[PDB]
Symmetry: C3
Subunit: 359 residues, 3 copies
């Protein structure tokens, strides 16, 4: 037996200053996942449609479905979201969660204010492609859940009794919130979750059955690698959504290994690089930092290939690890310095791999 990682990644780019792209991925490794419960199979579906361009609103949906050991899980969430200002963004929404025989629903309203610690022009003009951006991000959340199970009233009253009876509740809550190795992953990425504030508890804010209502804030700090904070605008290109976008991702896994597929189509794949050039967006760092926590437990060979198809007439002007071949606007990366880049990022490395291209 030998442990090999087989992957194929594909990127097909829309033309113009359309930043749109199709992304496809297939991956196979015969190594165990680091889930203490297995088998672990999961499918995710994300869609997003322009709702009101002019007020900036987008309607986004997410369906998470999985089976763990044997337990069937489901979570959906659909929400309306828009930029109010450069740092203030707002949301109203709804969803449901389910695990085996249990389900509940929920609705919410939420604001999020993203603040960079500094905004120097001596930085702006001297660093062409900046990466690290330190900042802190402020969530303000109104959420409601119908209390229609009796598990829900039990957890409600357990919590209501926990608050007010403890006082280190907005501190210790993080122990519960960031379950398992999620806790550890906070510091791995230079991420800090502040203590919460509870600004109220209401019963019953909804005429149907009893409804449990939470008014709470938290804050999260990042030292620079946290894409949520560092890449606040970019990660939400409402402005480029001229039509509905979508991604389907899935994995199957067990003691024998991991299989994953990805298919999607969405803006943000390429960005203006300055100077008539464009690039594939900078690799977000959290995916690589957090997968790093699992990627080092078995030695593997890399059988990996990337294909990039540029729009018609476009040429690559520069590529970090260089490509192996080209055939009109199709470029392919395989072995050599690219296989070493793939080994590197799978294990936690964030070494830059850059592709700039122009007509």
């Amino acid at each position: 037996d030998v442990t090999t990682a087989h992957s194929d990644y594909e990127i097909v780019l829309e033309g113009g200053s359309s930043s749109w792209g199709k992304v496809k991925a297939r991956a196979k490794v015969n190594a165990p996942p680091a889930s203490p419960l297995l088998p672990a199979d999961c499918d995710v579906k994300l869609n997003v449609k322009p709702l009101d361009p002019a007020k900036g609103f987008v309607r986004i949906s997410a369906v998470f479905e999985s089976i763990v050991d044997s337990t069937k899980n489901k979570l959906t969430i659909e929400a309306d979201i828009a930029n109010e200002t450069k740092e203030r963004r707002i949301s109203v929404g709804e969803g449901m969660v389910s695990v085996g025989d249990f389900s509940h629903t929920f609705s919410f309203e939420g604001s999020v204010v993203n603040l960079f610690y500094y905004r120097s022009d001596a930085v702006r003009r001297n660093v062409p492609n900046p990466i690290y951006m330190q900042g802190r991000q402020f969530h303000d959340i109104l959420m409601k859940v119908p209390l229609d199970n009796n598990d829900l009233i039990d957890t409600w009253e357990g919590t209501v009794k926990a608050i007010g009876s403890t006082g280190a509740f907005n501190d210790w809550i993080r122990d519960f919130w960031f379950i398992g190795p999620a806790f550890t992953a906070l510091n791995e990425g230079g991420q800090r979750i502040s203590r919460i504030e509870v600004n109220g508890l209401n019963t019953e804010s909804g005429p149907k059955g009893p409804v449990g209502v939470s008014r709470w804030r938290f804050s999260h700090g990042g030292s620079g690698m946290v894409d949520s904070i560092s890449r606040w605008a970019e990660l939400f290109p409402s402005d480029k959504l001229n039509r509905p976008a979508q991604v389907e991702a899935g994995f199957r896994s067990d003691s024998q290994g991991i299989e994953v597929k990805v298919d999607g189509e969405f803006p943000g794949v390429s960005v203006d690089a300055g100077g008539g050039l464009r690039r594939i967006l900078n690799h977000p760092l959290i995916p690589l930092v957090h997968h790093g926590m699992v990627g080092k437990f078995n030695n593997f060979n890399v059988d990996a290939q990337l294909k990039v198809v540029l729009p018609k007439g476009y040429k690559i002007r520069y590529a970090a690890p260089q490509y192996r071949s080209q055939n009109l606007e199709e470029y392919r990366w395989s072995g050599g310095a690219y296989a070493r880049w793939v080994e590197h990022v799978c294990k936690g490395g964030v070494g830059q791999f850059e592709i700039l291209y122009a007509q």
Copy 2:
């Protein structure tokens, strides 16, 4: 030179709902330990006897002996311990420490209260084999040490003067307490040690010589992987100790490598799995998480084998990584997906490897 890990693990299971088992292990790797002082040789002996079944009391002993670089160390501790309630457990005890020419003794009384943050029945019934359990655990400690060296009065007065003269003492103490990489290992496992409280300092609580007396509390939180908090009941099967149990473990190590042997016999090895099945208990996560911090520094081949001997007539119904062979109730795991599991766990992975069996 090539770096190989040679190991053999053996598990012989007592019948019935006896959860008792014999555990044996031998391990060899020709890679250096990550101790900044070497050679590093250590032997540990643990025993435990039923003292008063009816009041739940157990008498447990531990002897740690080591030699580091050249320094001879010894620590023993024997204590009486029992479950008072489901979360409150109590202890009274004594021991000694020694390093070269230095020794001191000590006696103690201690309570520990283990609290889960939540207890939902929607979880209980829908997840057959749950792993992550978030909680917090409260130590309340009366300890006494005879001040019979003058190193002991020096450390006493140094400490007495440190307290009261500092005020961030119950915070900074963690810097001293979790020496070296032990500090780091706290966050690795989703573990938090809260600040201490000091509830008094007494002289001299003992008629013989002067006696230094500390009344202090601390708290520790875990996000789910902390077996101490997550597996509170299980890790202390007083109820299954119908006779004295024991474990002898040892390692020899240096710049040339690591050798380890383990022999023991104790309850808790198998558990009822529900449905007439039993399993080997879930792998505790802290051993794997903390050994992970050292297991990634040299590449190695795996020459590893597990033998499980079931009681007479019992069959394995399921095994994660499957076994290679069987001969009556002896099952053996070697190479393939098992060697990959062993590589994985030695390096920090916690991928589930499950064995369920029944008559």
Copy 3:
């Protein structure tokens, strides 16, 4: 393609209880750095001269020059520094920073008080070569920067407005201060940076242009591996600087790999070991702990050799990983247990490799 690490390290030792030595290193690996911006090329120059032996003063200089992606960076700092007491040390100094079209200058005065949490004699006498030393270190800093750009007045007023307007400023500042993975590296090494105090803000403390003036303190704790705290005296051998010392180090790097050279000459290389023996100083732990965070992302072979040249007549009495050869006072380590030690330390291991020698 195969990934190999090629290195050569050389140590030439001055005789007597001169602790002086020449250190040379060359390293090559064809693996990518974990910098999200590449190419990344950097040169560093450190010098140090006795200024006033009798008052213990040393004059030290540092020049950091780099190019990242395409951005040209420079930082120099020269300072006068001396031991006042065993734990209090003082500094006065100056420098400049520059990035592209931007530069500023600065002058400073600073004290640093290094405190060990404990000083037991039962430790001192029983552990011949102690490593872990827990402690905390207190910086007290007066710094001034001419406000001669308008980027500098902009950052000044932005900061002045940030202080006083926020209140969790001396907490959140760490998010900004420890940019990127630097934050994470704090906990990796058992290192804690406390909140700051701001003891004043002054304008304009300098007759020329406007001058921004900061009076601030911070504290840092280490659990034992932090060489700054654990090896406070040793890391600053002012007493052994009978002449000017120096080190030139440099690396070139990109998607293709990493190249590094080092040349220097300075005291502190060997230490009295007790018993007529001397050793190469204990490996500092932070270099190895922090490089560990990058060293595990690509598999590699080791083609490494260490040469040690002892002074004339000196013999090695003991070496951890043993040497392969000797020719008069030249000793060479290659392959076997040494290549495994090199793999180990490059990946984060701190396993002791010891060399003791005497006449």
